[PDB]
Amino acid sequence: MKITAARVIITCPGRNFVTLKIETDQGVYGIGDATLNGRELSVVAYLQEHVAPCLIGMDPRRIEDIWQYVYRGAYWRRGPVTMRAIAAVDMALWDIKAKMAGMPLYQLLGGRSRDGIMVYGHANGSDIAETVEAVGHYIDMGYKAIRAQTGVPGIASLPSVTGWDTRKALNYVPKLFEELRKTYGFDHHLLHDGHHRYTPQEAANLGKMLEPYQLFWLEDCTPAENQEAFRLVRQHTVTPLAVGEIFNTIWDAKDLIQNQLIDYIRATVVGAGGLTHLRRIADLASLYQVRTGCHGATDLSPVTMGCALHFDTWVPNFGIQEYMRHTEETDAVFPHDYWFEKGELFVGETPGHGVDIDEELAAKYPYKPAYLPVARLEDGTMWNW
Amino acid sequence: MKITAARVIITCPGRNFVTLKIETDQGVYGIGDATLNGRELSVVAYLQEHVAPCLIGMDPRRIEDIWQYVYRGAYWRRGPVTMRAIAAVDMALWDIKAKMAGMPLYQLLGGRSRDGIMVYGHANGSDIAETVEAVGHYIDMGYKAIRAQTGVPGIASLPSVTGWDTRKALNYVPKLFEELRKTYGFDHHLLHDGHHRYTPQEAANLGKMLEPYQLFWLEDCTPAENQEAFRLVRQHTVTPLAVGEIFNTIWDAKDLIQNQLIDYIRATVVGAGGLTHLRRIADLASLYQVRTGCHGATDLSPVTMGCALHFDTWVPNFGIQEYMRHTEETDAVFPHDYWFEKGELFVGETPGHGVDIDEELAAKYPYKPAYLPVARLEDGTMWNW
Ligand SMILES: O=C(O)C(=O)C[C@H](O)[C@H](O)CO
Ligand SMILES: O=C(O)C(=O)C[C@H](O)[C@H](O)CO
Ligand SMILES: [Mg+2]
Ligand SMILES: [Mg+2]
């Protein structure tokens, strides 16, 4: 058995998505997500111009070997572009193996550990009043967990520039959660995304102020290239901590996990090298009772969601799954076997990861440049968005 | 003052090279290296399709702000592709600032700390006899330091597959250095590149066996994604340790440095985000008396070498500079103001980093795909090349 082609497909059914399709001389084929929001074409080149030519002729059944080949063979290891390419290959290969086995992917990973996959939605508002309303809406839709984000009073052809001020946020954010618990009580899981805006001391300060509100987690409270950054936070607060959507290898989280500085690892199948590698991250996390909390914004295509759900269905130390709804056009371009119902996602029995791509339809939505925004402090200082 | 264009130029005068040219409305321009061996086009896309459009209209004098903008603004941080792009921008901007100041780059960094730049050459042989002869050649040429690599008995358009066996190497490499010292004595600096082939224990074993031969350094002895990997080596041998050519940010070396696990940091201007970032790496290293030993293979264009030499001329804790001669064609495409003389490199007084690119000549050498080799053990296990 041999790989006869590894093609990259680009489409924009509401937003940009890059997909890798691996074809074999035995009819069966697999697809993987390679989307890197804001830098999509760099991954297209990485795959199309370098990796794909190497895959031709290889035995697609050798998932581990190919993973090691692309990971070690690159010589320059790790990285967002590098790991997105590896992830696309890995997803496509697991898709092929599950199809060949005649089973939905989760069966190959070890079988079902749960029925439904708990998710959380995004309740946003320009102020506390509006955000409180948004959370109520998600509660009415049957969500068990809701992430609440509010604008702070006083604070995509090219990157939009957003402003930020820590003191203003510190004086406002706690009030949001105080009102939420006062309004809806403590039955629902409430989440907050710090989005890399605080220093460790400020994150500890915020976490402490949020303690009486029992949050499910405070996410990405401070930049984590330095894994010691969560030390001060963990030492001063019991508010659960989550991090990792931008991580791409287990090396980005090894210390955060072993030093027990986090409660949830947010790494994803597309961000951290496919099922092959994400499984290793989850296993390490399980040793310290850290649970998975896979990132799941819309810039992760339905192919990733399919793989993520198969993973979530099997993984023992499952925590929660982020869920942002894709547009109808995206759902049409990426036929998938998973659905949402009363606060939970469910993956189907379709062999493979259950997702596919309609190449003919995909071609009707041409690529369109789009950037993530950037953030600057009031004095103009480049900050973390 | 504004950036009017940020163009990517590709040329293959003996091997592939990618250059970024930043033009301004004032007229002055700067160039930077963006070459990523074996994955060159991914950086081309990263710069051409994403970063470049953002630079237009920016004030090229704001080197630090632009570095932070591209680094933080990408959202997905670090990585070989990411940092190569950032380095190309940084090199071009420093080139511009030095031209505007009317001074060679080293003057802007803090002035001259030394006259010549000590380098090491590459003595290679199929066996010990041949390698010993090769080292004698570099000694003849006036090299104060020589890297010695030998083939081990019993051990392009697509990646070549090389073989490897640790036990065979462990039984042979020590003999190479024993013969070198017996033949040439201890006056010259002798280096060895383990090239990621050993586990920490084996590296510690090799390190101890090489101790009687007083090496300048044992390089990349074991894969370092896990910075704790050098612990065992450092605990068991006094042989100097070097690592870092594949690193792209200070985060890849922070622990190796602070835990005093290495003696030389090999990060480069092109690999680790330009002068702006490499400077921070060098400063951290100096606190622990770790010295710079910049990587300098041919896949680093003359633009990188120029910037590297300006850096080497100033940096207080300079250790050594690797030097692999480029082809005559490459030197013609990249006119530079630096030269070699009796084991030392010297940077010139030309304002900027002293290097430029002849676009008309560059266009005569079209890109040609070339991959780095991969390594497999005797049983077929994918290994580190
Ligand atoms: O939903 C979240 O948790 C996010 O932070 C969304 C991210 O900004 C987005 O996926 C970046 O592409
Ligand atoms: O010369 C050295 O130290 C090297 O290891 C060379 C590398 O293999 C080469 O630059 C990779 O592109
Ligand atoms: Mg987030
Ligand atoms: Mg080396």
What domains can you pick out in chain A, each with its CATH number? 1-104+350-385 (3.30.390.10), 105-349 (3.20.20.120)
Q: How was this structure determined?
A: X-ray
Q: H helices of B157-210, where?
A: 166-184, 200-210
Which residue, judged by its Cα, is nearest atom 1 of ligand 1?
A: A297
Catalytic residue among B50, B189, B195, B277: B195
Return the half-sphere exposure (C-beta side, CA atoms, 13 A cut-off) of residue A183: 18
A43 alpha carbon – ligand 1 mean position (Å):
19
Answer yes or no: do B225 and A53 touch at CB < 8 A: no
Is B189 marked as a binding-site residue? no
Task: Say if CB B105 and CB B56 are below 8 A apart.
Answer: no
Out of A270, A295, A324, mutate this one to test ligand 1's pocket (max ligand atoms within 8 Å of CB): namely A295
- Residues with Cβ within 8 Å of B197's Cβ and at least 6 positions away in sequence, in order, are B164, B166, B169, B375, B383, B384
The number of the ligand 2 atom at minimal distance from the alpha carbon of B122 is: 1
Which residue, judged by its Cα, is nearest atom 7 of ligand 1?
A: A297
Task: List B residues 74-113 in contact with A (Cβ-Cβ < 8 A).
Answer: 74-82
Task: Say if CB B114 and CB B106 are below 8 A apart.
Answer: no
Is B299 marked as a binding-site residue? yes
Region for residue B342 given its phi and psi (left: phi exceeds 0; alpha: psi -120 to 50; beta: otherwise): left
Task: Say if CB A161 and CB A374 are below 8 A apart.
Answer: yes
Question: Which residues are registered as beta bridge partners of A31?
Answer: A21
B346 and chain A: CB distance < 8 Å anywhere?
no
Strand ordering across the sheet containing A374-377: A161-164, A374-377, A382-383
Nearest CB to B42 within list A45, A53, A271: A45
Strand ordering across the sheet containing A3-11: A3-11, A17-24, A29-33
Site residues for ligand 2, CB cut-off 6 Å: A 75; B 37, 193, 245, 295, 297, 299, 322, 372
Count of pairs with CB atoms under 8 A, one residue in A, one in B: 148
Return the half-sphere exposure (C-beta side, CA atoms, 13 A cut-off) of residue B279: 17
Query: Which chain A residues have a beta carbon less than 8 Å from that of B45?
Result: 41-42, 44-46
Catalytic residue among A189, A195, A277, A326: A195
Lookup result for tokens 């520039």:
A161
- Three-state secondary structure readout of A304-319: HHHHHHHHHHHCCCEC
Residue A346 CA to residue A336 CA, distance in Å, equals 11
Looking at the CA of A385, which ligand is closest? 1
Nearest CB to B74 within list A39, A54, A65: A39
Nearest residue of chain A to residue B375 (CA atoms): A73
Q: Is B22 helix (H, G, I), strand (E, B) or coil?
A: strand
Structure tokens at A98: 């599950």
With both helix axes pointing from N to C terminus, report the angle between B302-314 and B80-101 in degrees, rounded to the nearest 10.
70
Is A299 marked as a binding-site residue? yes
Structure tokens at B31: 């160039």
Phi first, then psi: give them for residue B31, nearest 5 degrees.
Answer: -130, 155
Element (H, E) at A125: strand A117-125
Task: Say if CB A247 and CB A266 are below 8 A apart.
Answer: yes
Answer yes or no: do B80 and A79 touch at CB < 8 A: yes
Region for residue B145 given its phi and psi (left: phi exceeds 0; alpha: psi -120 to 50; beta: otherwise): beta
Is B122 marked as a binding-site residue? yes
